[PDB]
Amino acid sequence: SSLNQLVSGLASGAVRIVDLTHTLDPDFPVIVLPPEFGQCARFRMEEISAYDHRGPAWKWHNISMSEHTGTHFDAPSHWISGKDVPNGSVDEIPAEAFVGPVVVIDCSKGAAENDDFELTPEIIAGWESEHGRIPEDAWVLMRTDWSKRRGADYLNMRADGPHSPGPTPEAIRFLIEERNIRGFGTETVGTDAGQGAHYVPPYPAHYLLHGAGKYGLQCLANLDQLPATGAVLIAAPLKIKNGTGSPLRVLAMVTE
Amino acid sequence: SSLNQLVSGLASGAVRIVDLTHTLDPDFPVIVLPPEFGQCARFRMEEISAYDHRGPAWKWHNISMSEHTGTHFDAPSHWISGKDVPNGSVDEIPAEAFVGPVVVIDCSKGAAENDDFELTPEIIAGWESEHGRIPEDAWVLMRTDWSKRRGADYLNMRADGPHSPGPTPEAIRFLIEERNIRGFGTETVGTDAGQGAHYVPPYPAHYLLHGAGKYGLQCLANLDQLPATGAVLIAAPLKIKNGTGSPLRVLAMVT
Ligand SMILES: O=C(OCc1ccccc1)c1ccccc1
Ligand SMILES: O=C(OCc1ccccc1)c1ccccc1
Ligand SMILES: [Mn+2]
Ligand SMILES: [Mn+2]
């Protein structure tokens, strides 16, 4: 069976698990929005006990964050256009959606030359000319190697807001309507470009993906370790009551 | 590849995914300890915006809880016996540990007749007579259907503390030393029995599992959906800096 073979390959290393997750840490950057709006929180942790009088044989912590802190998953109810999608919160998404095929589009060269690099229909067509049609119900990850930025260059805020790569409205429309993807993931804090408020419609990845019942992943790491095709993504969010998203441990299984 | 077969089996329904997780909810019970100790927090959530003046096109929340709230994973650094284990925190555990074979020992009939039911070496031996030995580096789940208890029946507190099933020290030692298991999971708030402070050593599942660099799962649901053998568990904890555990979404793939 595929599962018996999977177990054997995982045990030998013929199938490797790549962790695509950043550490949840108080100093890891989170999305910043215009100052009139409520803001995403940083991760925070505090000891309950540490093998001391408060708990002599154990150590454990209280934790707090936002649904959108760190490496995290976006459900359709996160956007106003997804507010009527069935199974639209993280606690209702069917579990078969948490494991599936993934394709990785390498935009790292373009992102190194232009902070506002755009994933376009033409680039997707170029990718499919080499790797074949994107399979139905796949995750599509836009690799940029942005996850290697370790300071203020990660959010990359300028006077008019953040400058980071993302998809155009036409790219997202193509992936949804012509390829029926499961979701879209990036290495930045947004599935939209940093300047995505100025597309038509604003924040088109969010507006269109979630309006169509599709999912988002943000702040992925280590996409340069993945093949363009053939890997399997594990992206199971926390089962938050009526939740719009969650931090999560994103993994890819890779044949090697 | 074994991955292309998996993808097409998930798409066709030949492979199914069972969710083994309880919803994170302020009302779901969390572990309660003697009152002189620090306590686990309940899950809490509050809106940042809900398509409103605070965020006109989006809805999202702040959340708070403990590492050990809800369906959750225990890393070896959670116990004092785990102090000298390498890679003992949830952000350091090798990722291959997060997907693996699982076996399920059905103790539901015993738990229905004894709140303090004990999984013993004898019960494990009976299971192995039927199913063959527990595979090396497998997750072992003690099924009790305790996850069907709601409200106060789930913690099941009495004047002498909580009454819920769990393993004996000898059962855990057998699984670690003779079968080299990866970890142990239950449908209760602890990998130990509710009255497990009274074993030698106290809380032996925690003490022995984490002292051996092994993992725990607690508050699992839906274990009655799983076969005794052949399923694959997905249990990937949040990547908390130096974390001792985390809430997580536990799943099982079943053929
Ligand atoms: O990603 C969106 O902003 C795009 C973006 C991308 C990068 C940085 C900042 C913003 C977003 C997410 C949640 C709420 C509102 C907007
Ligand atoms: O596993 C027990 O507590 C161990 C423990 C001690 C301190 C912290 C975490 C875990 C347990 C089991 C059932 C009910 C209550 C407690
Ligand atoms: Mn988000
Ligand atoms: Mn715990």
Author numbering:
A (entry chain B): 2 to 257
B (entry chain A): 2 to 256
Paper quotes:
The structures of LaIHA:benzyl benzoate and LaIHA:isatinate were determined at 1.50 Å and 1.79 Å resolution, respectively, while the one of RsIHA was determined at 2.65 Å resolution. The Mn2+ is found in an octahedral complex coordinated by His69, His73, Asp75, and two water molecules. Asp75 forms a bidentate contact in LaIHA:Benzyl benzoate and a mono-dentate electrostatic contact in the LaIHA:isatinate structures. The mono or bi-dentate coordination results in two or one water molecules as additional ligands, respectively, preserving the octahedral geometry. The side chain carbonyl of Gln219 in LaIHA (Ala224 in LaIHB) is found in alternative conformations, one of which coordinates Mn2+. The non-binding conformation allows additional water to approach to Mn2+ (W1025A/B). LaIHA shows the highest activity in the presence of Mn2+ confirming that this enzyme is Mn2+ dependent. Notably, LaIHA could not be activated in the presence of both Zn2+ and Cu2+.
